[PDB]
Symmetry: none
Subunit: 287 residues, 6 copies
């Protein structure tokens, strides 16, 4: 009986570990992208998927999703063809090693946000990140906002190093937000002296429950910038513009909708001429 | 020093040893699975499992660790309170039973709550028990609410990885994506490992979804009997079905509003019959099942 | 070579050693349980537990593996975000504490979040610790919303497997089925094993449900003191209840609409009491 | 990952359990035969082997010998042919179900006496015996004695039911003997109200370290008698007489040896004309 | 649903709760360890431990999983056989006890068989319990055979990481390699973690090695009392030592051969002491 | 919350991540195993493992749970006692190391005490690590005392499941039964799973069995070097061998009694050579190895 090494009931290591040292010889960036907390425009799913599809990807550790998942809250999708079941869409939670367009290795934590054992999960992710010499941890988030899809995508950034988010202008005072595994990971990681940064992309609220690839693009572009990675984005941008074109059509068809969007454009332009909405929208998504 | 009952830690205890499970002809047992928590229209799954256990000789083979697999705050156990103190708790079960039909043919019954947690580990344990125990066929029970009258023959959607086992039925489905269930995933996983599986999803009038409808349990069991080659004593359950059926007619005929809903359904149903009949010379399933799955 | 803290793995670590838990009497301790997540009108269960821990000498006896017991996606712990980063996480706790009352009588307090998972295994651990510690009586806390005004005496309902402990209450109830809570199930199971159990359910005006209402917590603890023969120092809790009470009376005289609503409840409460 | 049911680190159940009910419908007898305590004439090994060879045998549970064995005290024998290893003699510890000559089922616990965890082992054997309805537990033992191979084989019996050993005449007062897993099993089993009996066969001391099949025969004959089993002994008796013939030859060849044997014959005959030696011989073997 | 006793699985069950282990002083308890299976001349380690448990108030604090720690084939526990059946098994124990001395000062005693297995994991458990209980000093017991007569004062050798605790002894030793014992390793590891440790090794006439010789046990405990500032009641132990002593002197005057042997040892002992 | 280092509970901790173990040519690492406690004539196993770890760049890959695998009362750790207190404990190790030879070729070294307990579980863990890590060849080290002089070339008995790997040697053995060892059983188990294995058992003069004899360690390592295609820096060990060799001559030439024993051996040895040589134109192994195995 062969025991596949790792941490029992948490993760299995995939052998062998990849090489994660750069040309300059410094540590990898770690990007985390967990679904189940706030998935407006399904931006997090699409961002992770693209990286995996568009880049060289190797499994480093697969987490014990079966021990972490509430299957009755999030039932796996099954396929039925005529008179029998033909496919099961199995949930995943994994740590990947990727290489960017000039072969710079980085790590990707992606899959379902676990329902259970956040602290054991997060301690495990940190230990792995430390063993692999992670220099910077980057989290992805989305949040619905009263913004149009016809104006540039906006984004709130958070970090424990103010130099890392100097391109941003914080419009938030002390607030209380529901926790996510990603946010708690970011925080626990910070309590241990690791450099963390996260980006929460703003998605028009009427697009909350559809694929909005542009949102993913914005996140990934920001990841490229902050982590010194070169990410092949063209296919995502292509898909993003395709969806944009289709959304324009559904609006220029319904006089009702267009006013809603136009009204949002008007308001968008006012803010540019220069927290509580963030708190209300996150709490709704967290349920 | 302290006794340890054998099994799989954190998954099930065996009631060792298990009874003889082979037929007079050396053939292996049928395995029936009936789990509540996915879709329970007519409470048909609970009723069918309860009837088998009540009407036939029943032995425990394995107790699953329901305490390890249940979200208690989503499904709080019902407690009885009498004046000033608690008198009873409805305890959740998840068990594998050995039964014998009316002529002594052994078979297995997996019944209780659908788990919230650990479906893969759970399914593997069942698949491993079924193999150890010689299982030759695995039959799943299901319900789904549908726009059909209680006044027309009970219909049913069959599935199997062997078409001969369901030649009596006319596939009313093409490709669809439905929320998975422990029972369905068990059936799928079982098939992936070359086991023979079959499943019956009975149709319950949507106006009867949250009530006891023994007729639907009887239909399921009558089907298990044909497919499994079992003789199942259904008399008492049929009696209950009839009694309930008569209460529903009385109730529907006392409300000209519900009397119309029903009459309308009878119309659609006869028309779908006639149409499917003449053809002899899907989205409802999805919308309704996904609705319950929440 | 690596230090392992004693307990029941996946369920609790003992804070070893426990304090002494027998009185001069030699009699066994009372056990109080106060779990949140079932019904928390007025936040009265959190408030009552927090007060006991703040006003008395408190030592941890056991930490329950809350990380093994919690559905984090259902109860996302609150995080504090200030400007451009996270400054705090509201971390969940589930603990068994040992306390001494105002004259040094020792007792136990089980407090924290109601677990989502493993109720039986949890309840067996509590029972086993209670037995080893010689628990003589087990007292449950609860709150429920009622159509009742804050300007009338605080109602509470009692249950027990021993009718002599609740002789002061007039049970206006008879057979019902209710969804269980970890606390309710703890109480029932204890009873099945012959332990003496009692519980108290305080009634909170429905319009104060999602508010700190210390008066309800004070009411609960007053009852614990009486039933458990404990001397509990409630001065500071009572000061807070009065503060809160005063501000509510104020809201009432400030809005003619609000005043009428409350007046209407006073009429019902007064009507019901004659029955 | 399939978990083979049983008690982790102790035994695996072999499926399915056999039928152990008789014609009269009463429980099986359980015979235990453990090697490593006192194996004069290798009588215990040979007794177990014969039953397994001569009878229908099915595995019920295999114990976790790898968790119970001191491999450096009792190294498994390996076979080397010319320039490589060709075989490993793997240790075993098993519960078997057998049928006697008229198909009466009984149980056999046989293999190495474990070095470790006697109490966990014994609790496990008892639980299994109770689940299977064992009515009587029968232990096998050997002990070297100053007796000849030319006189009938003698045997001490012990039991918690005096009726079961009425054919015997106890020549022992209160003594202290080193423990064996078999003896402790017998005792623990008795403390729990189970009917136990054991037979310790007396083996000429100069035959301690050779196969003396007759000793096995005596034990098995006694087992047949006490458990109401019919055991096909002819092959064992054949082998026993063969060995007897060879031992006669080694003695009628050495004037030295023969006097030793003759002297023992003389003493054997005196005792027939009608504890501390038992204590001295057992303690030596137990090391 | 099934009751689980708290501890470290596969290593120990706590007898929960422990007694109080701090003196009126508030000072921490002394820890004594007395393990058998390394060197047991005179059975002095068993005897000393047995006496402490018999003469003082004794409560079990932890039971070590002796069944997980013992090689039964090396140390076959004795069974009693009377006529035609087994009447008794001498069951192995490995325990941490809490004791009170003659004026109520609490202390700890680790006693039983030296384990065969898992010394590090064992030693870490002992250390962790000692720390939690606030152990202030750890005292080891040992015996060795020597060519020395029973008619001369009982010699004993001492070791410690603090030379002030053994200032009364004249170390006639210098670098040697010796096979470790669980007790020796416990002591060394404790020391590595900054705990204050001391050990005592009593010397037993080689001709009394496989005999109960209570005088040696009494000598050890007298030293524990002194080093640990404990008041131990030894009257009954001393009575037994005298009984045994008297019977040995008797054997000596009864056999001219034996008397000469002992006389010869008296000459050597007396010769050595001048050095 | 508290950190958990990955591995197999109760068997080994990984030092994660492991170094690169592939050669400049994509080829996998050689695995060398050197375990003490079976037969340790000349202390040759300990010495050879110690030299590799001291002379080459060494990284820990896995620490085995020696505390779970050792009988402490059979092998008590040596402790140093200085006047009145303990100053040192010789702690037992059982570890899997990654090393690099003099040109940077990575290889693995398994070294430390032969366990008393759990050989199967232990062996499986090693076999599973070797597979995960790409091992292409497993080389075992051994000693056995033999009637041979320290004054003649060191001989050696080779074994392998590939004859080409040991074509340099002349099998001096037919069928035999020897007490098993963890190293031997590892080699056997490994072969059972289609792995390439080889093993060298060096011959130590029986009068040198309980002393350091670095020559025998050097011979072993020189062999690992040929078979494994490794460049091993042996200079310092050779120096030690020579120094020890010169002390033995001095000592043997100062005792005309031992001078004869040796001279007698030289005679037998030259005769066995000449005889085996002319043939070109077993029980000792058993009796001696079994003797040590106790």
């Amino acid at each position: 009986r062969e025991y596949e090494p790792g941490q029992p009931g948490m993760y299995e290591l995939e052998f062998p570990a990849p090489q994660l040292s750069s040309s300059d010889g410094r540590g990898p960036v770690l990007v985390h992208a967990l679904e189940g907390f706030s998935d407006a425009g399904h931006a997090i799913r699409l961002a992770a998927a693209h990286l995996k599809a568009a880049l060289d990807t190797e499994l480093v550790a697969s987490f014990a999703i079966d021990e972490l998942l509430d299957y009755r809250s999030r039932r796996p999708l099954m396929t039925f063809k005529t008179d029998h079941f033909t496919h099961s869409d199995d949930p995943e939670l994994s740590l990947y090693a990727l290489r960017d367009s000039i072969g710079t290795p980085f790590l990707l934590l992606a899959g379902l946000e676990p329902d259970l054992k956040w602290e054991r999960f997060i301690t495990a992710v940190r230990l792995l990140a430390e063993r692999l010499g992670v220099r910077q941890t980057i989290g992805l988030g989305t949040v619905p906002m009263a913004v149009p899809h016809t104006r540039p995508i906006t984004m709130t950034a958070h970090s424990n190093n103010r130099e890392l988010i100097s391109d941003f202008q914080p419009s938030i005072s002390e607030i209380q937000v529901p926790g996510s595994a990603s946010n708690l990971l970011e925080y626990r990681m910070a309590q241990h002296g690791h450099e963390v940064v996260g980006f929460t992309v703003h998605v028009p609220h009427y697009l909350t429950q559809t694929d909005y690839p542009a949102a993913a693009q914005a996140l990934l572009e920001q990841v490229a910038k902050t982590g010194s990675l070169q990410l092949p984005l063209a296919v995502l941008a292509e898909a993003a513009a395709e969806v944009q074109a289709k959304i324009d059509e559904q609006v220029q068809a319904s006089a009702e909708v267009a006013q809603v969007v136009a009204a949002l454009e008007r308001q968008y332009d006012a803010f540019i001429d220069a927290g509580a909405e963030f708190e209300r929208f996150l709490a709704q998504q967290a349920e």
